[PDB]
Amino acid sequence: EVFNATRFASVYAWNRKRISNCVADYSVLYNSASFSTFKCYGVSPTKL
Amino acid sequence: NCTFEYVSFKNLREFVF
Ligand SMILES: *[C@@H]1O[C@H](CO)[C@@H](O[C@@H]2O[C@H](CO)[C@@H](O[C@@H]3O[C@H](CO)[C@@H](O)[C@H](O)[C@@H]3O)[C@H](O)[C@H]2NC(C)=O)[C@H](O)[C@H]1NC(C)=O
Numbered sequence: 001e002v003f004n005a006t007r008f009a010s011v012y013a014w015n016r017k018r019i020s021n022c023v024a025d026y027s028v029l030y031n032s033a034s035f036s037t038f039k040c041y042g043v044s045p046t047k048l
Numbered sequence: 049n050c051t052f053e054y055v056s057f058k059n060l061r062e063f064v065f
Contacts, residue, residue, distance in 0.1 A: 021052065021054075
């Protein structure tokens with residue numbers, strides 16, 4: 001929902017959405033290749 | 049401000065919190 005929302009917020013006010021009590025498919029998100037750049041400074045994609 | 053939110057005589061209704 002957040003990534004594929006019809007309107008993506010501008011740089012002026014980057015919207016903050018809080019997700020809780022959810023199963024996080026971080027591996028699936030990494031698997032998605034449409035996003036050009038997936039960079040983790042402080043996390044490990046394998047460990048995510 | 050809502051870190052967590054969940055939405056969805058004849059009787060006695062007990063409870064323990
Ligand atoms: C949840 O609690 C209340 C809900 O009514 C709101 O608190 C406001 O949140 C801001 C930032 O989100 C906080 O700013 C604080 O202001 C002090 C004094 O100006 C400053 O030293 C800091 O910058 C501090 O973060 C503050 O708790 C409060 N705003 C004000 C003007 O008092 C808010 O909706 C929610 N967040 C927090 C943190 O309470």
